[PDB]
Design a protein around this ligand. Sequence first.
Ligand SMILES: [K+]
Ligand SMILES: [K+]
Ligand SMILES: [Mg+2]
Ligand SMILES: [Mg+2]
Ligand SMILES: [Mg+2]
Ligand SMILES: [Mg+2]
Ligand SMILES: [Mg+2]
Ligand SMILES: [Mg+2]
Ligand SMILES: [Mg+2]
Ligand SMILES: [Mg+2]
Ligand SMILES: [Mg+2]
Ligand SMILES: [Mg+2]
Ligand SMILES: [Mg+2]
Ligand SMILES: [Mg+2]
Ligand SMILES: [Mg+2]
Ligand SMILES: [Mg+2]
Ligand SMILES: [Mg+2]
Ligand SMILES: [Mg+2]
Ligand SMILES: [Mg+2]
Ligand SMILES: [Mg+2]
Ligand SMILES: [Mg+2]
Ligand SMILES: [Mg+2]
Ligand SMILES: [Mg+2]
Ligand SMILES: [Mg+2]
Ligand SMILES: [Mg+2]
Ligand SMILES: [Mg+2]
Ligand SMILES: [Mg+2]
Ligand SMILES: [Mg+2]
Ligand SMILES: [Mg+2]
Ligand SMILES: [Mg+2]
Ligand SMILES: [Mg+2]
Ligand SMILES: [Mg+2]
Ligand SMILES: [Mg+2]
Ligand SMILES: [Mg+2]
Ligand SMILES: [Mg+2]
Ligand SMILES: [Mg+2]
Ligand SMILES: [Mg+2]
Ligand SMILES: [Mg+2]
Ligand SMILES: [Mg+2]
Ligand SMILES: [Mg+2]
Ligand SMILES: [Mg+2]
Ligand SMILES: [Mg+2]
Ligand SMILES: [Mg+2]
Ligand SMILES: [Mg+2]
Ligand SMILES: [Mg+2]
Ligand SMILES: [Mg+2]
Ligand SMILES: [Mg+2]
Ligand SMILES: [Mg+2]
Ligand SMILES: [Mg+2]
Ligand SMILES: [Mg+2]
Ligand SMILES: [Mg+2]
Ligand SMILES: [Mg+2]
Ligand SMILES: [Mg+2]
Ligand SMILES: [Mg+2]
Ligand SMILES: [Mg+2]
Ligand SMILES: [Mg+2]
Ligand SMILES: [Mg+2]
Ligand SMILES: [Mg+2]
Ligand SMILES: [Mg+2]
Ligand SMILES: [Mg+2]
Ligand SMILES: [Mg+2]
Ligand SMILES: [Mg+2]
Ligand SMILES: [Mg+2]
Ligand SMILES: [Mg+2]
Ligand SMILES: [Mg+2]
Ligand SMILES: [Mg+2]
Ligand SMILES: [Mg+2]
Ligand SMILES: [Mg+2]
Ligand SMILES: [Mg+2]
Ligand SMILES: [Mg+2]
Ligand SMILES: [Mg+2]
Ligand SMILES: [Mg+2]
Ligand SMILES: [Mg+2]
Ligand SMILES: [Mg+2]
Ligand SMILES: [Mg+2]
Ligand SMILES: [Mg+2]
Ligand SMILES: [Mg+2]
Ligand SMILES: [Mg+2]
Ligand SMILES: [Mg+2]
Ligand SMILES: [Mg+2]
Lengths: 386, 154
Amino acid sequence: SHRKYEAPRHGHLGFLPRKRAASIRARVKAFPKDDRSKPVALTSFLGYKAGMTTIVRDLDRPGSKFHKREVVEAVTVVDTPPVVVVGVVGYVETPRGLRSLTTVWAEHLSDEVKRRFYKNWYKSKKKAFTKYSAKYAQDGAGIERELARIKKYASVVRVLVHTQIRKTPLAQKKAHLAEIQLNGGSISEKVDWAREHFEKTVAVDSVFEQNEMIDAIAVTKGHGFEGVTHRWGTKKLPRKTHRGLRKVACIGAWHPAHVMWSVARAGQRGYHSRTSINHKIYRVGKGDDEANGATSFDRTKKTITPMGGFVHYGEIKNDFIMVKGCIPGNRKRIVTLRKSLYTNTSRKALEEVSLKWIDTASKFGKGRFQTPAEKHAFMGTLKKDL
Amino acid sequence: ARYGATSTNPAKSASARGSYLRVSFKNTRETAQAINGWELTKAQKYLEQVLDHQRAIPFRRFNSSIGRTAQGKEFGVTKARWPAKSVKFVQGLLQNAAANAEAKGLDATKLYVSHIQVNQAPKQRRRTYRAHGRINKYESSPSHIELVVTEKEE
RNA sequence: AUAUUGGCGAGAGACCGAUAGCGAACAAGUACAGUGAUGGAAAGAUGAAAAGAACUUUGAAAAGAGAGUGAAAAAGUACGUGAAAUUGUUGAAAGGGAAGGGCAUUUGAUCAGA
RNA sequence: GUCGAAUUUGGGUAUAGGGGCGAAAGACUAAUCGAACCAUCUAGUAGCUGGUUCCUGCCGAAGUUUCCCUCAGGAUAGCAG
RNA sequence: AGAACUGGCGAUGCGGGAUGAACCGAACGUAGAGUUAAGGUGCCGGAAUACACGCUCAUCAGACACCACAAAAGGUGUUAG
RNA sequence: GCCCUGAAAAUGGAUGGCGCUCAAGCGUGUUACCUAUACUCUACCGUCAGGGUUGAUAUGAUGCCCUGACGAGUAGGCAGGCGUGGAGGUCAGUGACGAAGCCUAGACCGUAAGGUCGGGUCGAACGGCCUCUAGUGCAGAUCUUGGUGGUAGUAGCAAAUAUUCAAAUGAGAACUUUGAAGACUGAAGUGGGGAAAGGUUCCACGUCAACAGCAGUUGGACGUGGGUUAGUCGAUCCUAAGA
RNA sequence: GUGAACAGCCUCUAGUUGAUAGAAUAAUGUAGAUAAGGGAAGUCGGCAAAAUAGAUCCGUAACUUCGGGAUAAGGAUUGGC
RNA sequence: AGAACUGGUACGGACAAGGGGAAUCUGACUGUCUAAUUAAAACAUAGCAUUGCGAUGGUCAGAAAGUGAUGUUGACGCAAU
RNA sequence: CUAUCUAGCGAAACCACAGCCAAGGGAACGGGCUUGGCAGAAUCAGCGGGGAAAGAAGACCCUGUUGAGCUUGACUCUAGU
RNA sequence: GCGUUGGAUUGUUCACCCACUAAUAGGGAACGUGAGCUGGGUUUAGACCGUCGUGAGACAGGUUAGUUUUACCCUACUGAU
RNA sequence: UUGGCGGAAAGGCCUUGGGUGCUUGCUGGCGAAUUGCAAUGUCAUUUUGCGUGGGGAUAAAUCAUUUGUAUACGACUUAGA
Ligand SMILES: [K+]
Ligand SMILES: [K+]
Ligand SMILES: [Mg+2]
Ligand SMILES: [Mg+2]
Ligand SMILES: [Mg+2]
Ligand SMILES: [Mg+2]
Ligand SMILES: [Mg+2]
Ligand SMILES: [Mg+2]
Ligand SMILES: [Mg+2]
Ligand SMILES: [Mg+2]
Ligand SMILES: [Mg+2]
Ligand SMILES: [Mg+2]
Ligand SMILES: [Mg+2]
Ligand SMILES: [Mg+2]
Ligand SMILES: [Mg+2]
Ligand SMILES: [Mg+2]
Ligand SMILES: [Mg+2]
Ligand SMILES: [Mg+2]
Ligand SMILES: [Mg+2]
Ligand SMILES: [Mg+2]
Ligand SMILES: [Mg+2]
Ligand SMILES: [Mg+2]
Ligand SMILES: [Mg+2]
Ligand SMILES: [Mg+2]
Ligand SMILES: [Mg+2]
Ligand SMILES: [Mg+2]
Ligand SMILES: [Mg+2]
Ligand SMILES: [Mg+2]
Ligand SMILES: [Mg+2]
Ligand SMILES: [Mg+2]
Ligand SMILES: [Mg+2]
Ligand SMILES: [Mg+2]
Ligand SMILES: [Mg+2]
Ligand SMILES: [Mg+2]
Ligand SMILES: [Mg+2]
Ligand SMILES: [Mg+2]
Ligand SMILES: [Mg+2]
Ligand SMILES: [Mg+2]
Ligand SMILES: [Mg+2]
Ligand SMILES: [Mg+2]
Ligand SMILES: [Mg+2]
Ligand SMILES: [Mg+2]
Ligand SMILES: [Mg+2]
Ligand SMILES: [Mg+2]
Ligand SMILES: [Mg+2]
Ligand SMILES: [Mg+2]
Ligand SMILES: [Mg+2]
Ligand SMILES: [Mg+2]
Ligand SMILES: [Mg+2]
Ligand SMILES: [Mg+2]
Ligand SMILES: [Mg+2]
Ligand SMILES: [Mg+2]
Ligand SMILES: [Mg+2]
Ligand SMILES: [Mg+2]
Ligand SMILES: [Mg+2]
Ligand SMILES: [Mg+2]
Ligand SMILES: [Mg+2]
Ligand SMILES: [Mg+2]
Ligand SMILES: [Mg+2]
Ligand SMILES: [Mg+2]
Ligand SMILES: [Mg+2]
Ligand SMILES: [Mg+2]
Ligand SMILES: [Mg+2]
Ligand SMILES: [Mg+2]
Ligand SMILES: [Mg+2]
Ligand SMILES: [Mg+2]
Ligand SMILES: [Mg+2]
Ligand SMILES: [Mg+2]
Ligand SMILES: [Mg+2]
Ligand SMILES: [Mg+2]
Ligand SMILES: [Mg+2]
Ligand SMILES: [Mg+2]
Ligand SMILES: [Mg+2]
Ligand SMILES: [Mg+2]
Ligand SMILES: [Mg+2]
Ligand SMILES: [Mg+2]
Ligand SMILES: [Mg+2]
Ligand SMILES: [Mg+2]
Ligand SMILES: [Mg+2]
Ligand SMILES: [Mg+2]
């Protein structure tokens, strides 16, 4: 017989399987469509989620009941140190998909990126790329021919870049290596861009701008084995239920005489690769620029780092991208931010935010003070110091 | 006397056995198969590491729904255990075989486990009490263990 | 003269041969169960003779490896022989969600016949 | 729920099976109650269910007639050896 | 659900109807050779992508009896009267 | 006539599938081709029938030979044979120089029931033939007894707040002893005694093969012993319901 | 000792430290709880849970067999010195 | 019993410990049973009513008895409803 | 506290053989058959769709010329009176 | 393709009404789904009433109380080696 | 050996120059037998090992400890000369 009461399905079948991602770094499965008139530029960047805070900004939304007055908005801050270009990968179009023709790496690789190629760095002999570095003996004749093949072929060109993770407070110490597609015309210039940029750093200012809508690709926070009630949002069974109530009552009809893929069942929740789109950047702040967390209306000399440091992450000392709302992944986790795959014109994009105030109070509690100066000015003299 | 089927030289071999030993037959079989064919000293070191929980005995036949461990990767398995009782019994039999080989005058540095087999001894029977006034068996599965160590040749 | 599944003493069998024959070939109406009336098993075989393994060695020991007794230890009191189910070791072979089978032949192994 | 009197309970004693006992439920009567348990009659009967142990060769059916307190059965004639 | 005649299944394998107790063909010792039955000759699959005259284009075409369905009524679709 | 509308059902699926469009569709005609345990011929097996052949040495006339036809089959009937326990006769049968039995992807005979041989193991009896006899053949009976599996080293060994350190003993100590600490029963006790019941569980010594669902050096276990002292405590005496 | 109290809790004498343990802390469970706003809209049904609770003082209805209802309901207070 | 002072207005501070009200059906109440699915409105109860019987009897036992229960009883009793 | 892993210990239910589906037919709902889809060792924790899962020779219905408990001027008797 | 509700009564499916809503469409999947729950109903044994029956008892007549057992196996699915 | 082209799976294609061998384009000499009248009458390519020489380079992973961006256990993420 019929369900007797219609209700929307619990969970989304397009996010299957709900398994652990194969890597702690989420894969960028699509890059922006290449427009061969624009200059050569990175279409993505590599950063690490530091934490969240709040801001105040005037809402610029004509037609809204609440236009031109102040809104408090949550923002996620991602530490984004400049990425070092260490390679170049070419992809030629084949009737079976894209295929990597060849990859040309930089002459000298830092131990940070070399650590990625070892599971046991402490006892290794660090022989990686030592014969490859000999390819640059006198003129790099093999290298220039290898790049020439990329120009003659390889309709898609990607640079191999790695995070400068020793600049982050993370104890990881091992960089994350990823391929970023080079958009912009004249593929030959793409290889010229990559070859010129070997061993060179690329800053987040050259990828992202204020007010830009970007895509967050990250592996969500893992939660281990989870019951159906929280994994899918299924209704809790009554208290009277025997053998437990945090279950799905009917997992299938008699026929088909099988459990169907569409039935919510217990398993791993989280640690999934997600690509969340249309998150607006509110800040592209600079690590060397003291008073990061200040705005044109505050001017107070305070960095973006909250009082006592970002909880579970540490202090931010590099370039950071502040996005509106939240992004997949937890603190300290590698995240990749890419360009929007389309041109969004809906007055939520193209809306030019100007921050009025940034919350720098401690996230380690019910923070009362933005800066240590304010704490002294409020409480006055203490017995320990001050 | 009259051990299992062996294809090694009795003049270059030394045997030891233990009968009606109250140790789990399945665990003892897995322990014996873990060192079957190994050198004597290497097998003894491996058994000491197993006792120390540094290495594990891969469970190949009697392994259904036992559990997974990372020490099985060197044996190409996910299911390995640390059957300390079986390891101790096999260590006793190994030192017995080493003593017999020394008595016969065999090269202890060339000794390898040429043969080892565990089979089921007669079961020692107890009783367990079950709901609604029922009685079920609670039998042990003891082992007859035998091994022969031979000098390696060419 | 006739009866006699009891008692005693005998002689026999085209009877049974230890799951059979009386329940009981054996410390059997015994062990054991039930309050009780009653119910009621399982259980024979080393070897001619213990000649039942002196002694050496390893182990805390049980025992093991030697040695030895014995016609035989492929007879070690867990003992005449010693199947099958089931199990270990070695050897051989096959194996994409059963396996097993028939017709015919390949291949490998093995083999009788002139 | 009841908890100072139709209270609870130990020991001794009385009531024994178509019997006892029952402030009554066919309840209890030694885990057995709309007739306890044990032994015997008893290898009780069953038109009903299940099983029914070696090979080969030859021949080879019937579910139809009549009757039966007969309709899951039998006798009778027919088919078959 | 119940009768009549016959043939079958039950009791029967084999070839065909993919698959099936009943249909078609044909009933069977062990084999060889040849020819066929019913059924088929694009491949699965052994056998002509054979010959010949025509019809049909279906935005749910059609494709071997038993058999696994389709009707009344309509169409300047197309063909022959 | 073909095609289309009429023509809507629930897991995804059925000219059998692929697929097929002057078809590999439909109507019709002509050939060639494919193959059943069918048909024709032959070989062999058996059955039935008709015969020939005591003119011998010819020992199997229930024998040998010729000819023709046939062979499906449940329930069921009959016939010819295989096998087992025991019995009469016979083989002046086999066997401790190895009987029976058992194992043997080793060989031979029979359509088959089965029979024979080779090898290993084993140790004391056994077999062919003619005939007699039956407690004479197993795959089933939720068959009986006994043994054995997969399940499976799995379920589980989770109530009673709780154990920890050191030393000693010991081969071996989470569990034994001692000491220290932390706790609990909190006098309607996890205390001290008793009635019913049990019967040596009491205590000491030695001691761990089995039990104490882990362990164990410990024990209500194992082996050997020791221990229950009444004129006054009870029975004994009295009677109660009752016998 | 607290306490009306042989209630619950703690302690003294006495006794025990006996329940197989070790490591992590997934789901779902068993037992114990909490939860913003709403307050039975859940459900057959307020099932389960919560709320009230001791003592002192004030006050206490319908009905009534005049005995009760009644701790009706509804209220206020409670420590230490 | 009263007063003063005192405090994060807390104070039966742990433990401990009624939820209450308006009614309807039903049994008066206390009590009793289906041990091991039914605790109830079921049974029992005091009250009420009926019946039998004056012992050579009523009711009920026993196979029978020179045998019994009520009855160590006597209608304000026993027995059956 | 489990569940999980480990050290030790260590069962039971159940088991024709076993285990991937769709359709067909079939004893009219197949794991095996037919046509297709497909299909790669060995596994762990959950889970409750399926195995028309397990637990019991259906207790409901019918049959049996099978009972038993109980009732009545069924039939035939009988203790007592 | 995507939605198709919150409630009063009633075990109910169904029905009816209140109200929101864009709408409150109809159904299958062993009349999907009890080793997923619950047990309100039906549908054991206790009990009351009405009718019927002399009676034991009967009622698609009403009412009250009334044990919902097992996964650790294979597959399927969710995850994990 | 020179140079160029080919990336869809290029792994191949085209080309300059010379050396060596055959050359059936034509004309000669020598040999075949006995594999007994046929027997595929062994001529191909596909891996692997081994020995002799020459050329070439001189690491990681897992366990264990640790981490916690992870987690039932595996696994994942880390760090440690
Ligand atoms: K009757
Ligand atoms: K009865
Ligand atoms: Mg619907
Ligand atoms: Mg959420
Ligand atoms: Mg429940
Ligand atoms: Mg905070
Ligand atoms: Mg498993
Ligand atoms: Mg138990
Ligand atoms: Mg018991
Ligand atoms: Mg006997
Ligand atoms: Mg014997
Ligand atoms: Mg012998
Ligand atoms: Mg023997
Ligand atoms: Mg065997
Ligand atoms: Mg598989
Ligand atoms: Mg085959
Ligand atoms: Mg009744
Ligand atoms: Mg009989
Ligand atoms: Mg015939
Ligand atoms: Mg029948
Ligand atoms: Mg029949
Ligand atoms: Mg068909
Ligand atoms: Mg016809
Ligand atoms: Mg063909
Ligand atoms: Mg028409
Ligand atoms: Mg049509
Ligand atoms: Mg065809
Ligand atoms: Mg045609
Ligand atoms: Mg033939
Ligand atoms: Mg025949
Ligand atoms: Mg006999
Ligand atoms: Mg012999
Ligand atoms: Mg065999
Ligand atoms: Mg003898
Ligand atoms: Mg017999
Ligand atoms: Mg049998
Ligand atoms: Mg049979
Ligand atoms: Mg059986
Ligand atoms: Mg049995
Ligand atoms: Mg377990
Ligand atoms: Mg438990
Ligand atoms: Mg406890
Ligand atoms: Mg302990
Ligand atoms: Mg102590
Ligand atoms: Mg205490
Ligand atoms: Mg003692
Ligand atoms: Mg134990
Ligand atoms: Mg022990
Ligand atoms: Mg003693
Ligand atoms: Mg006295
Ligand atoms: Mg006081
Ligand atoms: Mg709340
Ligand atoms: Mg609130
Ligand atoms: Mg309220
Ligand atoms: Mg409601
Ligand atoms: Mg509701
Ligand atoms: Mg309640
Ligand atoms: Mg009050
Ligand atoms: Mg009141
Ligand atoms: Mg009452
Ligand atoms: Mg009272
Ligand atoms: Mg009860
Ligand atoms: Mg009750
Ligand atoms: Mg199917
Ligand atoms: Mg069908
Ligand atoms: Mg099946
Ligand atoms: Mg198939
Ligand atoms: Mg489960
Ligand atoms: Mg299931
Ligand atoms: Mg039945
Ligand atoms: Mg029955
Ligand atoms: Mg009849
Ligand atoms: Mg009768
Ligand atoms: Mg009767
Ligand atoms: Mg249903
Ligand atoms: Mg179900
Ligand atoms: Mg259920
Ligand atoms: Mg109910
Ligand atoms: Mg009446
Ligand atoms: Mg488990």
